[PDB]
Design a protein around this ligand. Structure first.
Ligand SMILES: CCCCCCCCCCCCCCCCCC(=O)OC[C@H](CO[C@@H]1O[C@H](CO[C@H]2O[C@H](CO)[C@H](O)[C@H](O)[C@H]2O)[C@H](O)[C@H](O)[C@H]1O)OC(=O)CCCCCCCCCCCCCCCCC
Ligand code: CLA
Ligand code: CLA
Ligand code: HEM
Lengths: 49, 195, 98, 137, 242
C-alpha cells in the first residue's frame, strides 16, 4: 500500500514482476497474496538461478 | 567539627574522579576501538559519595569490582566484611534482598548532596553503579557512547611498546644470526664428513 | 508509566519476611516442627486464603493438625496471589534444588 | 589429634546423654554410609528428593527428633516422613524392609549405631559443606 | 485395540479419536444424573495470526501460517465435572489435563509467532433447554492464558523475571532507561474464549466430536513485543460419562 517496491529503492526486482514472478518462497507476494506460493521459480529461484 | 555534608562537599572534584574504576587502565578491551569517552561517556560531574544505609540504620559498603571482571554481582557488606545486602539471582530463596532488608541510600557532596533515595529500584541501581567507585553523571549522547569501558592512553602505549618490543628481540635474534653467519647464509658448503 | 519486576516487589511485602500461604514455594514448609510432609500438601492445595486464619478451617483437618497450624500460625502471611509466582505449578517444584 | 574425642562425641537421647565415640566406630561409619549407599545420598544432600538434607538442624526439626544417635536408628530400622505421619518403609532402605534393599540386610545394631554416629559427626568437621552441595563443594 | 508399539511413529497420537457416521443420535442427559467428561480432546489444524495491521484503519487481517514444530500441537486428556444447571444447559468445568501445548507457527513474512495453544481453567457451556447433546448443541466459554514462558527463564545475556541477571549487564555504563522494556520482565495473564459445535454423537457411548475455534493471544516475551492475536481451528473429540 504505502511501501511498494519503487519507494524502497528497488531497481531490479521491479522486473521479476513484469515477466511474472510475483512471490518469494516465504508465503508472500507483491500483490499481497496469501497461502499461494510459487514453484521453484520465485524470486529466490530467479536469483539462485 | 563539620557536617558529614560539609565533609564530602569538601572533597575535590578531580580527586573523586580518580576513584572511579572507569579510569583504571585495565578494564578496557583489545578491540574496544576508542577514547575512554565513547565508553562511560563524557564525565560531566560528581554526583556525591553514596553511603548505603541498612533499614536498621547500619552503614554498609558496596563491595567493589576487582579489575578482572567485566561482569559483577553487587554485594553490600557490613562495615566488617559481613554480608547485609545483595541483588539476588535465584530471588525465590532470597534471604538478603534490598527490599526484604530495606536497603537505602543517602548522598553527601556532589550535586545530589543532602538528598536520599528510598525506593527499592533506584537504591539498587545507585549501588550497582557504585560498584564502579564514585558514581558520576556522564553525557553519553554527544559522542554517542556505548556503555562499555575503554583503556587510557597509558593503557594503549604500554600494549604498544609491548608487542613492538617483544618482536624486536626477534629482529635482534634474526639479524644477529644473519650478521654472524653471513658466511653460511648462501649454502652449507658442498664439502662434508669431518666432525 | 513505570513498569516494575513483580517478584522483586512482592519480596518487599511480608512475603520476604515470613511464609506466604498463597504463594510461597512448598519448600519453605519444612522449617518448622512437623509441617512439611502432609499438612503442606493440604496447605498448598486448598484454595488461596484471604485471611491468615482461614487455614484452620480447612476441610478434614485433623484434631492434631488443627492444633499444629494454630501453633505455627505465627509465621504465616498473605498477599494477593501472584500470577507469576503460582503459574506453572512452580509452587510444587520451583526449580530450586540444593 | 584433630579428630578429637569429644568432637567425635555426639548427642544420644532427646534428653541430653552423650555417647562420645571411637576411631573404630567412626570408620565403620564411613565404610557403612557409602556401602549403605550414598548413591542418591552422596555427600550431604539427597538426590531422590533434594528438599531434605542431613544437616544437624534438619534432623532436629524432624519428627520425632532425629538428631539423636537414637533417632536415626529408629529410622534406619523403620522409616517415617518428615511428618512422622506415615511410615515410608517401602520406598526407603530399612530393616523393616530388607527384602527390597539388600544392602540393608547385613546391617546390625552395631553397624547401625556406626552409620548413625557418622551422620551426627560429619557436620561438626565439614561445617556447611555437609548440607550444601555443588555450591559449597 | 491399538498398542503404543502399534501407534507410535504414525504421528497419530497427536490426532485424536473419530466417531463414525452413525452419529447425530443425541446423548440422553438426565438432570437427575451427575455427569462428568472423560478425556476431552482438541486436535487442531488451522492457525491464523491476526496480521498486525499497518497504521491504516481499514479491517485488520487474519493471515494463514505454516506449522513449525511437527505434531507437538494437539491437546487432550482434559477432564472435568459436566454441570447440569437450571434451564437445562450443560457447563463443563475443567479441573486438569494436558492442555498447554506450545506451538510456533511461521507468519506470512518470516516471522516466527509462538503462542501457547491452551484451553486451561476452562468453563464451557451450551444452549439452554437441552436434554440431549446433538449436532445442534454447542459450547462457548472462557480461558486463562499465562505466557509462553514460566516465571524463571533467562533470556540470552542473563536477564530474567523471577531470577536472571536483572539488567543491561553486558553494558555497564550504558544508558539505564529505555531498556526497561527488556530488564524488568512483566508477566501476562489473559482470556481465551473457544467455541464448540458438535457434529458426530453416539447416544450410548457418551462420545461426541466436532469443530472448535479458539481465539487467544501469543507470546508476551516478558515485555519484548506486544502479542499478536491468534485464531485456532480443528476438530475435537470428547467422551462423556455419568
Ligand atoms: C621480547 C624479548 C624477550 C627477551 C627475553 C629475555 C629474558 C631476560 C629476562 C631478564 C629480565 C626478567 C626479570 C625482570 C624482573 C624485574 C622485577 C620487576 O618486574 O619489578 C617489579 C616492579 C613492579 O612494581 C609493582 O608496583 C605496583 C604498585 O606499586 C607502585 O604503585 C603503587 C600504587 O598502586 C604504590 O604507589 C607504590 O608505592 C608504587 O611502588 C604493585 O605493588 C605491584 O605488586 C608491583 O609488582 O617493577 C619495577 O619496578 C621494575 C621496572 C619494570 C621494568 C619492566 C621491563 C620489561 C618488563 C616489564 C613490562 C611489563 C608491561 C608489559 C606490557 C605489555 C608488553 C610489554
Ligand atoms: C544498471 C543500472 C542501475 C540503475 C538504474 C540502478 C538504480 C539504483 N540502485 Mg543500483 N547498482 C547497479 C546498477 C544500477 N542501479 C550496479 C551495477 C551495482 C553494483 C555495483 C549497483 C549497486 C547498488 C547498491 C548497494 C544500492 C543500489 C541502489 C540503487 C537505487 C538507489 C539509487 C542509487 O543508489 O544511485 C546513486 C546515484 C549516484 C551515485 C549518482 C552519481 C554516482 C555516479 C554515477 C556519478 C559519477 C559517475 C562516474 C564515475 C563519473 C566519472 C566519469 C569519468 C569520465 C571521470 C536505484 C534504484 C540502492 C538501493 O536502492 O538499495 C540497495 C543501494 O543501496 N545499487
Ligand atoms: C632472548 C634471549 C637471547 C638470545 C638467545 C640472544 C642471542 C644473541 N645475542 Mg643477545 N641480547 C638479549 C637476549 C638474547 N640474545 C637481551 C635481553 C639483550 C639486551 C639488549 C641482548 C643484547 C645483545 C647485544 C648488544 C648483542 C647480542 C648478540 C647476540 C648474539 C650473539 C651472542 C651474544 O651476544 O651474547 C648473548 C648474551 C647473553 C646470553 C647474556 C647473558 C645473560 C646475563 C649476562 C647473565 C646475568 C643475568 C643475571 C645473573 C640474572 C639475575 C636476575 C636478577 C635481575 C634478579 C646471539 C644471537 C650479539 C649479536 O648478535 O651481534 C652480532 C650482540 O652484539 N645481544
Ligand atoms: C543407607 C543410608 C541412608 C540413611 C542413613 C538415610 C537417612 C535418611 C533420613 C534421616 C531421612 C529423613 C531426613 C529428615 O527428614 O530429617 C531420609 C529421607 C529420605 N531418604 Fe534416605 N537414607 C539412606 C539411604 C537412602 C537411599 C539409598 C535412598 C534412595 C531411594 C534414600 C531416599 C530417601 C528419600 C526419597 C527421603 C525423603 C523421604 C520423603 O520425604 O518422602 N535414602 N533418609
Amino acid at each position: 500500500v504505502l511501501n511498494p517496491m519503487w519507494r524502497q529503492g528497488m531497481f531490479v526486482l521491479p522486473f521479476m514482476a513484469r515477466l511474472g514472478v510475483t512471490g518469494s518462497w516465504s508465503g508472500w507476494s507483491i500483490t499481497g497474496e496469501t497461502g499461494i506460493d510459487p514453484g521453484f521459480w520465485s524470486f529466490e529461484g530467479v536469483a539462485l538461478a | 567539627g563539620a557536617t558529614l555534608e560539609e565533609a564530602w562537599s569538601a572533597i575535590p572534584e578531580k580527586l573523586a574522579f580518580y576513584d572511579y574504576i572507569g579510569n583504571n587502565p585495565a578494564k578496557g578491551g583489545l578491540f574496544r576501538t576508542g577514547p575512554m569517552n565513547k565508553g562511560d561517556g563524557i564525565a560531566q560531574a560528581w554526583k556525591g559519595h553514596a553511603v548505603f544505609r541498612n533499614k536498621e540504620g547500619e552503614e554498609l559498603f558496596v563491595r567493589r569490582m576487582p579489575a578482572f571482571f567485566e561482569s559483577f554481582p553487587v554485594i553490600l557488606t557490613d562495615k566488617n566484611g559481613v554480608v547485609k545486602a545483595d541483588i539476588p539471582f535465584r530471588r525465590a530463596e532470597s534471604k538478603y534482598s534490598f527490599e526484604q532488608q530495606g536497603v537505602t541510600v543517602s548522598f553527601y557532596g556532589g550535586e545530589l548532596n543532602g538528598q536520599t533515595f528510598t525506593d527499592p529500584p533506584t537504591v539498587k541501581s545507585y549501588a550497582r553503579k557504585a560498584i564502579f567507585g564514585e558514581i558520576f553523571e556522564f553525557d553519553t549522547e554527544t559522542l554517542n557512547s556505548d556503555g562499555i569501558f575503554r583503556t587510557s592512553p597509558r593503557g594503549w602505549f604500554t600494549f604498544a611498546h609491548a608487542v613492538f618490543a617483544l618482536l624486536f628481540f626477534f629482529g635482534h635474534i634474526w639479524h644477529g644470526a644473519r650478521t654472524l653467519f653471513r658466511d653460511v647464509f648462501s649454502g652449507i658448503d658442498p664439502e662434508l664428513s669431518p666432525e | 508509566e513505570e513498569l516494575v519486576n513483580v517478584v522483586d516487589e512482592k519480596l518487599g511485602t511480608a512475603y520476604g519476611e515470613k511464609i506466604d500461604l498463597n504463594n510461597t514455594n512448598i519448600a519453605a514448609f519444612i522449617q518448622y516442627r512437623g509441617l512439611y510432609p502432609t499438612l503442606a500438601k493440604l496447605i498448598v492445595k486448598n484454595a488461596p486464603y484471604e485471611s491468615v486464619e482461614d487455614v484452620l478451617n480447612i476441610p478434614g483437618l485433623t484434631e492434631r493438625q488443627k492444633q499444629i497450624l494454630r501453633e505455627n500460625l505465627e509465621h504465616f502471611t498473605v498477599t494477593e496471589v501472584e500470577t507469576a509466582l503460582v503459574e506453572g505449578g512452580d509452587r510444587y517444584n520451583n526449580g530450586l534444588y540444593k | 589429634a584433630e579428630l578429637t574425642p569429644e568432637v567425635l562425641t555426639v548427642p544420644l537421647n532427646s534428653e541430653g546423654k552423650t555417647i562420645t565415640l571411637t576411631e573404630k566406630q567412626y570408620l565403620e561409619g564411613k565404610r557403612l554410609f557409602q556401602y549403605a549407599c550414598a548413591s542418591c545420598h552422596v555427600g550431604g544432600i539427597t538426590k531422590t528428593n533434594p528438599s531434605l538434607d542431613l544437616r544437624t538442624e534438619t534432623l532436629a526439626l524432624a519428627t520425632p527428633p532425629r538428631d539423636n544417635i537414637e533417632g536415626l536408628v529408629d529410622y534406619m530400622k523403620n522409616p517415617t516422613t518428615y511428618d512422622g505421619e506415615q511410615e515410608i518403609a517401602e520406598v526407603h532402605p530399612s530393616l523393616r524392609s530388607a527384602d527390597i534393599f539388600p544392602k540393608m540386610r547385613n546391617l546390625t545394631e552395631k553397624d547401625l549405631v556406626a552409620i548413625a554416629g557418622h551422620i551426627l559427626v560429619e557436620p561438626k568437621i565439614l561445617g556447611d559443606k555437609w548440607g550444601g552441595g555443588k555450591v559449597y563443594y | 485395540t491399538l498398542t503404543y508399539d502399534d501407534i507410535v511413529g504414525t504421528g497419530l497420537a497427536n490426532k485424536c479419536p473419530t466417531l463414525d457416521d452413525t452419529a447425530r443420535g443425541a446423548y440422553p442427559i438426565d438432570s437427575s444424573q451427575t455427569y462428568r467428561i472423560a478425556r476431552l480432546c482438541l486436535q487442531p489444524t488451522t492457525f491464523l495470526v491476526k496480521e498486525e495491521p499497518k497504521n491504516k484503519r481499514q479491517e485488520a487481517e487474519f493471515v494463514p501460517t505454516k506449522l513449525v514444530t511437527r505434531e507437538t500441537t494437539s491437546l487432550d486428556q482434559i477432564q472435568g465435572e459436566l454441570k447440569v444447571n437450571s434451564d437445562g444447559s450443560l457447563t463443563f468445568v475443567e479441573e486438569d489435563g494436558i492442555d498447554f501445548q506450545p506451538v510456533t507457527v511461521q507468519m506470512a513474512g518470516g516471522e516466527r509467532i509462538p503462542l501457547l495453544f491452551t484451553v486451561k481453567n476452562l468453563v464451557a457451556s451450551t444452549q439452554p433447554n437441552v436434554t440431549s447433546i446433538t449436532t445442534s448443541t454447542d459450547f462457548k466459554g472462557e480461558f486463562n492464558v499465562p505466557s509462553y514462558r514460566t516465571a524463571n527463564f533467562l533470556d540470552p545475556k542473563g536477564r530474567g523475571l523471577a531470577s536472571g541477571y536483572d539488567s543491561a549487564i553486558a553494558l555497564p555504563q550504558a544508558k539505564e532507561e529505555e531498556l526497561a522494556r527488556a530488564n524488568v520482565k512483566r508477566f501476562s495473564l489473559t482470556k481465551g474464549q473457544i467455541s464448540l459445535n458438535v457434529a458426530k454423537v453416539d447416544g450410548r457411548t457418551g462420545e461426541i466430536a466436532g469443530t472448535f475455534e479458539s481465539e487467544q493471544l501469543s507470546d508476551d516475551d516478558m515485555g519484548a513485543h506486544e502479542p499478536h492475536e491468534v485464531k485456532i481451528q480443528g476438530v475435537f473429540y470428547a467422551s462423556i460419562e455419568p
